[PDB]
Design an enzyme around this catalytic site. Structure first.
Site, PDB file in Angstrom:
ATOM      1  N   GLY C  65      48.158  36.463  43.367  1.00 42.68           N
ATOM      2  CA  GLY C  65      48.865  35.281  42.941  1.00 42.68           C
ATOM      3  C   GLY C  65      49.438  35.445  41.549  1.00 42.68           C
ATOM      4  O   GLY C  65      49.005  36.285  40.761  1.00 42.68           O
ATOM      5  N   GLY C 114      46.182  36.791  46.230  1.00 41.13           N
ATOM      6  CA  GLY C 114      46.884  36.003  47.227  1.00 41.13           C
ATOM      7  C   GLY C 114      47.296  36.804  48.446  1.00 41.13           C
ATOM      8  O   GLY C 114      47.400  36.256  49.545  1.00 41.13           O
ATOM      9  N   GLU C 137      39.528  39.810  40.834  1.00 42.92           N
ATOM     10  CA  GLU C 137      39.421  38.562  40.085  1.00 42.92           C
ATOM     11  C   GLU C 137      38.291  38.567  39.065  1.00 42.92           C
ATOM     12  O   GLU C 137      38.314  37.751  38.139  1.00 42.92           O
ATOM     13  CB  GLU C 137      39.219  37.380  41.035  1.00 42.92           C
ATOM     14  CG  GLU C 137      40.509  36.783  41.590  1.00 42.92           C
ATOM     15  CD  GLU C 137      40.938  37.411  42.900  1.00 42.92           C
ATOM     16  OE1 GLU C 137      40.234  38.313  43.392  1.00 42.92           O
ATOM     17  OE2 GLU C 137      41.979  36.997  43.449  1.00 42.92           O
TER      18      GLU C 137
END
Ligand SMILES: [Mg+2]
Lengths: 233, 199, 452, 244, 266
Positions: C65, C114, C137
């Protein structure tokens, strides 16, 4: 021949038969074909790249992309008559596959015509099983022939150990000679050593050729005599 | 990709050529790559070409020009003769150096006919072979010409021909002689010129 | 040009991510357009399946993302825009997971963040030689955000009986490439890049045989078979990246009860006596887990703990709540935006120095994964509006799990040999017949999970 | 490609060689290196040709009559011989000579004992094989067991390539007459290849090459090595090699 | 083992038959000593050890010569999309497409054999009998290699009506039930026709179309693709390529048959 319709739609016609009741029992293939549809487009498909050499098919260079005088000193300021002709046919023509090795395969056998007399087997064993390191010429599972020279040449070129294809080819040639001289000396010495220990061979190559020539020459004599006698009469 | 494998495939390894398969001029050296098959593949008409070769072909060697043609055949000849000449030369032992330290198309040295180096003696149960003896066939009344081991060579006599020569005449080729191959060089055309002497 | 392109292939609808420079980084505009257009396609009777791909075909499918904007939306305190961003993204993920028509994702290239969300929630996800799969992440002070904590505990094949391989992938952020992703179950099929064009044509051609219902299991089977027709054998000199020893290391060290903390995993990593190399691998993991965000590690741990036993809708809602709270950062518990600034706006190789090092209490960590009264939130409604605990079609059309291999082996107890299991999983179950890596996967499972 | 066969109990062979004949570094020299060397050379000499599809025994039978393929023959012979020898000295796949083997010894070697024939084999190898060679106990079509000594890589199957006479040194008129008779018999064949029928098959094979004994015994002492070989044969294999 | 052989007496030598058995004993034990052969093609193994469809690579299709298409002067342009290029005066078949079509056709064969349908292998070129017979025998199928009688499907009563028919159970075990003349007289239509040389078998293809039988065929550069339900682009002129593709299809059918028997034994 017209693109046929009735080979790829057997399911649809069979289902019409089944729905109407003209056919009672469903065939064994029916569900299989229903789950695995046939391809029914049958289109001509364009191509935009030559698979072998990477040349792009279907690009036109514009006059803006030629801002410099050509070999005759003239700038290109407008399209020529070739650029204005639609080249859609090239998109569908199966491209000619080209390899530099083929130019280098032709040279070798022009320089060594008697390497053509070495029999070659075109039956492949398994192309996937080949794991060759062309840092050397001899390979396990391969013969020594022109292709060894040429594959070594290509290896030397792609590693940039030589800049010019000529020098890499010459280097490969001399390695090939080094190996061929060893092989021929091995053969000759093996025969000599075999004879020195009481190996009794039968017909050799020379005697083989002599006997075949004799077989042919007997028939030739008979025909010659018959023809001379016929001519005299 | 498929293209790289095709470039490396065995069919691709055979250099393109379209020289006539029925040449009737002078043959100095091979023109066509000899294709071989094993007995097991020959039993199934398999030669590594596109199409099955006809069952009439019992020989295991052929030469070819085109894999397929408009006539729906492969242009081939079931002949592998030029290998037997080369091997016969290797049996003679007479040697013929550019094999030692933009593109030139001329034949380099011997064109692969022989890689034997000049100076070496052939040990035998008798002893060192002083000179090479080979069977041959005198061809015609002429230095005479002799068919020796698949090559035409020049015959020189000690003193003169024997009576058998003119007794037989044009049938002189029917009888086998013994020759000493004096030497063997190769000319610019690619032709080997052996000099022999009748015995 | 628009960031997402929509095209047609004779019955399929193709959705191409169209942001090449930013490696197809996903936005709220992109997510909203995809969500609305998928809602449209769910009603169309002339649509049979959706294909998800990228224009930047070789390098990237979707490189995460676009959370840099989320980090600037929080440096300027515009928290509503971050909320909208995550609502769009996670509602899109929920839509893809529950979609009633086949969705086929081409994971040709980098697949992260994402991208995994776009690709992991569909039964048909294709890896190529270029697939570079990861979940990075932990190092930006963020959590597994796209339903990964729901999917990975369920889909991963090896060493995943208690979500411990899923935990390894989530916490370490290891890049899993090509056929390794296929063998781990992260991808369901493995197809060479050069074939994805032809496959795309084939997927555009097939239709349900009769009664024209593309939502039936019959059509999912048809799609599976048509994809299988384009799978080629793996290269001969290919070896699975994680040897049996390292799988033992992961199984031992990332196993936990439902109250285990990251400290437990660290103690396991310290206290390992498996073998010489497998003990150094545990030390490698020890090292790289110390470069991660201490708070994100615990947040990911509890998210896996709860979403590995929950249903899809609540799991994605929980991800939405956690993302909202992490952006709010009321109590400065998590350094998400501060490290997103560090590594997605300055490209500083050195890891962000994680100032906040504490073992967050269970209640201090329960309030960062819950709804909030001061700010209500909800995902957007979609045409399916169903929920479930297990995937309906995933298990059929990917490699078998160790759980399923055990279920077959333990059905013959209540004399089996290797040949029986291999031939069973290779030949008899219809949807998995001739599936690419059954032989090697079954060999691995039998080699490191049973004795005979 | 020709590959070295996998032997039974290869780990024990690499750890402790053959008990009572070879050390680990002796068996490695004679099998794990010499056989690899020979198989590599055969592969390089036959790759890309018909012979690549044939086992070494079939190769040596096919190339036995062709003078120019002698090198291939040599390789194909040694490989074959080297596995006939190793196979019948391997510890296992207490074996004793069968009744049939000893019966044929009594019917061939003038009713002699097996140990006497062993001593005769020691003597034959000591004298008639200068340098490299092979020692064989072979069965002819007459059901007769006799001792055959080949020089270098002669074969026991095909008598024109036995290479049982060293023509480098002087020979007796008996040997010369034997060679003359064999040459005449070879010429007697009608087949264009010039081959003959020979049903001789080896029962026992001993490798007299330096690759077998030199490391463990020395330049001399090959008689000791041959004695150790013949006292420690794998008689299961040797008994199976005799037609029942 | 070997009855009606009279051994010889120990005094006298081996006889010819004793020599034969002796060298057989040698052949099975010691003749294969010295080296094991690896990575060498043996023509018979394509028939008796065909690979599974999932294990086929482009390299193994290329080593079989499946990619070698017809002369460019005999091109049927409707096969344009199957072609990879031209090289040495012939068209090269795109083996990626060949592999995809081959897997599809193999799955069709497997599905039809798994359903207990009739599979017919048609190939009328010279040396194709062995592969056809083996494909039929391992699929419990049927084959023709001599000649396709025109009307074998559309005129089955006048041609195939006289030959005998048989009732079989789920396990393909003959029941040996007596059939009625009416049952014996009925048409028994194949469920699948696979033709190795479709260019010389237009009659069979047209009959399959009329009789509504799905068909598989090896489609060369001069063959019409639309005349068959499931084309396989490939070389139909080489016995090696034809036998490779046929063995693949036969093994897929064998796997389908094995699955059918497995569930019928459970
Ligand atoms: Mg054809």
């Amino acid at each position: 021949m017209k693109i046929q319709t009735n080979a790829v739609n057997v399911l649809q016609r069979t289902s019409a038969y089944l729905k109407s009741g003209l056919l009672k029992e469903t065939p064994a293939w029916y569900n299989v074909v229903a789950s695995i549809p046939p391809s029914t487009k049958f289109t001509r498909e364009p191509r935009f790249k030559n698979p072998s050499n990477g040349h792009i098919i279907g690009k036109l260079v514009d006059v803006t992309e030629q801002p410099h005088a050509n070999n005759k000193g003239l700038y290109k300021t407008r399209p020529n008559s070739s650029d204005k002709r639609v080249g859609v046919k090239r998109l569908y023509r199966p491209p000619k596959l080209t390899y530099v090795e083929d130019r280098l395969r032709s040279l070798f056998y022009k320089q060594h015509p008697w390497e053509l007399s070495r029999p070659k087997i075109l039956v492949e064993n398994e192309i996937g099983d080949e794991n060759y390191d062309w840092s050397h010429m001899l390979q396990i599972g391969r013969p020594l022939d022109g292709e060894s020279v040429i594959q070594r040449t290509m290896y030397l070129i792609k590693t940039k150990q030589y800049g010019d294809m000529v020098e890499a080819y010459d280097h490969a040639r001399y390695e090939f000679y080094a190996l061929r001289m060893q092989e021929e000396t091995e053969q000759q010495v093996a025969l000599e050593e075999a004879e020195m220990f009481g190996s009794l061979f039968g017909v050799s190559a020379i005697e083989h050729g002599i006997q075949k020539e004799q077989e042919v020459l007997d028939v030739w004599e008979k025909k010659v005599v018959e023809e001379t006698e016929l001519m005299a009469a | 990709t498929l293209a790289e494998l095709l470039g490396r495939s065995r069919i691709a390894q055979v250099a393109n050529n379209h020289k006539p398969l029925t040449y009737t001029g002078k043959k100095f050296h091979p023109t066509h790559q000899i294709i071989e098959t094993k007995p097991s593949t020959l039993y199934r008409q398999e030669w590594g070409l596109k199409s099955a070769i006809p069952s009439k072909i019992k020989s295991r060697y052929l030469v070819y020009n085109d894999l397929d043609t408009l006539e729906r055949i492969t242009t081939f000849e079931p002949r592998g003769g030029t290998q037997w000449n080369r091997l016969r030369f290797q049996e003679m032992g007479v040697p013929i150096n550019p094999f030692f330290k933009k593109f030139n198309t001329e034949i380099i040295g011997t064109g692969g006919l022989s890689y034997s180096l000049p100076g070496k003696l052939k040990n035998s149960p008798n002893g060192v072979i002083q000179r090479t003896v080979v069977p041959g066939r005198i061809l015609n009344v002429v230095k005479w010409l002799a068919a020796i081991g698949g090559f035409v060579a020049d015959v020189v006599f000690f003193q003169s021909p024997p009576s058998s020569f003119n007794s037989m005449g044009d049938f002189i080729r029917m009888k086998t002689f013994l020759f000493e191959i004096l030497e063997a060089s190769m000319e610019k055309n690619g032709s080997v010129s052996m000099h022999a002497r009748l015995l | 040009a628009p960031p997402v392109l929509f095209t047609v292939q004779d019955t399929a609808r193709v959705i191409t991510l169209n942001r090449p420079k930013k490696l197809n980084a996903l936005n709220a505009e992109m997510s909203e357009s995809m969500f609305k257009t998928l809602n449209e396609y769910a009603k169309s009777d002339t649509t049979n399946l959706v294909i998800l791909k990228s224009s930047n075909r070789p390098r990237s499918f979707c490189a995460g993302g676009d959370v840099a904007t989320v980090a600037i939306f929080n440096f300027n305190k515009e928290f509503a825009k971050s909320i909208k961003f995550f609502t769009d993204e996670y509602s899109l993920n929920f839509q893809i997971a529950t979609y009633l028509k086949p969705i086929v994702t081409f994971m040709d290239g980098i697949t992260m963040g994402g991208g995994v969300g776009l690709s992991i929630h569909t039964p048909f996800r294709i890896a190529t030689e270029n697939t570079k799969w990861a979940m990075p992440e932990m190092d930006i002070g963020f959590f597994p955000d796209v339903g990964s904590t729901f999917a990975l505990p369920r889909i991963v094949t090896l060493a995943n009986s208690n979500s411990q391989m899923a935990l390894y992938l989530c916490l370490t952020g290891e890049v899993v490439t090509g056929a390794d992703a296929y063998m781990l179950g992260l991808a369901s099929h493995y197809v060479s890049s050069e074939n994805l064009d032809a496959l795309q044509k084939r997927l555009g051609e097939i239709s349900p045989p009769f009664n024209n219902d593309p939502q039936s299991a019959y059509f999912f089977g048809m799609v599976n078979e048509s994809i299988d027709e384009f799978v080629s054998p793996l290269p001969k000199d290919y070896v699975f990246k994680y040897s049996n020893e390292k799988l033992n290391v992961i199984e031992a060290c990332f196993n936990l009860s439902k109250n285990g903390t990251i400290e437990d995993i660290m103690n396991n990593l310290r206290q390992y006596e498996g073998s010489a190399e497998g003990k150094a691998f545990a030390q490698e993991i020890k090292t790289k887990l110390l470069t991660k965000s201490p708070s994100s590690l615990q947040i990911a741990l509890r998210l896996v703990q709860e979403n590995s036993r929950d249903h899809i809708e609540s799991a994605i809602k929980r991800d939405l709540y956690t993302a909202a709270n992490m952006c709010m950062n009321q109590d400065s518990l998590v350094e998400f935006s501060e490290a997103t600034k560090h590594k997605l706006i300055d490209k500083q190789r050195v890891p962000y120095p994680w100032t906040k090092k504490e073992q967050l209490f269970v209640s201090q960590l329960t309030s960062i994964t819950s709804p909030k009264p001061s700010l209500p939130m909800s995902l957007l409604r979609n045409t399916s509006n169903v929920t479930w605990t297990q995937y309906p079609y995933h298990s059929k059309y990917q490699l078998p799990t160790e759980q399923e291999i055990a279920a077959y082996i333990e059905k013959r107890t209540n004399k089996v040999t290797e040949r029986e299991v291999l031939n069973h999983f290779a030949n008899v179950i219809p949807s998995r017949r001739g599936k690419l890596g059954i032989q090697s996967l079954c060999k691995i499972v039998c080699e490191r999970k049973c004795e005979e | 490609i020709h590959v070295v066969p996998k032997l039974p109990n290869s780990k024990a062979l690499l750890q402790n060689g053959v008990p009572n004949i070879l050390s680990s570094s002796g068996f490695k020299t004679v099998w794990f290196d010499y056989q690899r060397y020979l198989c590599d050379k055969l592969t390089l000499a036959t790759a890309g040709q018909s012979l690549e599809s044939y086992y070494p025994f079939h190769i040596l039978l096919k190339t036995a009559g062709n003078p120019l393929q002698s090198n291939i023959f040599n390789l194909a012979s040694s490989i074959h011989n080297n596995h006939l020898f190793v196979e019948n000295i391997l510890p296992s796949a207490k074996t004793e000579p069968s009744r049939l083997f000893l019966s044929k010894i009594k019917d061939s070697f003038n009713g002699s004992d097996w140990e006497v024939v062993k001593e005769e084999m020691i003597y034959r190898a000591e004298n008639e094989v200068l340098g490299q060679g092979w020692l064989f106990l072979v069965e002819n079509n007459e059901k007769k067991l006799f001792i055959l000594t080949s020089n270098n890589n002669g074969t026991p199957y095909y008598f024109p390539r036995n290479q049982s006479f060293d023509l480098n040194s002087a020979i007796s008129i008996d040997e010369f007459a034997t060679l003359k008779q064999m040459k005449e018999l070879i010429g007697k064949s009608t087949k264009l290849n010039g081959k003959v029928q020979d049903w001789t098959m080896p029962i026992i094979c001993v490798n007299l090459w330096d690759h077998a004994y030199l490391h463990d015994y020395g330049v001399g002492n090959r008689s000791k090595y041959v004695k150790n070989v013949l006292d420690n044969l794998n008689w299961s294999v040797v008994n199976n090699r005799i037609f029942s | 083992p070997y009855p009606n052989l009279i051994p010889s007496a120990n005094d006298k030598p081996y006889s010819s038959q004793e020599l034969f058995l002796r060298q057989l004993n040698h052949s099975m034990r010691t003749a294969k000593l010295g080296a094991t052969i690896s990575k060498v093609y043996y023509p018979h193994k394509d028939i008796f050890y065909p690979p599974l469809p999932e294990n086929i690579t482009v390299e193994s299709l290329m080593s079989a010569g499946v990619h070698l298409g017809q002369s460019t002067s005999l091109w049927r342009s409707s096969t344009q999309s199957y072609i990879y290029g031209e090289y040495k005066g012939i068209h090269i078949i795109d083996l990626n497409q060949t592999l995809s079509y081959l897997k599809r056709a193999a799955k069709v064969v497997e599905g039809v054999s798994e359903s207990g349908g009739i599979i017919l292998f048609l190939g009328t070129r010279q040396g194709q009998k062995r592969g056809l017979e083996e494909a039929a025998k391992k699929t419990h199928g049927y084959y023709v290699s001599t000649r396709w009688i025109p009307g074998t499907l559309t005129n089955s009563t006048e041609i195939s009506g006289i030959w005998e028919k048989q009732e079989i159970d789920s396990n393909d075990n003959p029941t040996e039930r007596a059939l009625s003349p009416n049952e014996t007289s009925k048409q028994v239509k194949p469920d699948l026709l696979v033709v190795l040389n479709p260019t010389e078998n237009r009659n069979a293809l047209l009959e399959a179309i009329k009789s509504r039988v799905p068909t598989i065929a090896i489609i060369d550069t001069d063959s019409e693709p639309s005349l068959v339900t499931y084309p396989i682009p490939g070389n139909d002129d080489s016995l090696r390529s034809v036998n490779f593709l046929l063995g693949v299809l036969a093994r897929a059918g064998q796997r389908g048959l094995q699955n059918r028997l497995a569930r019928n034994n459970e």
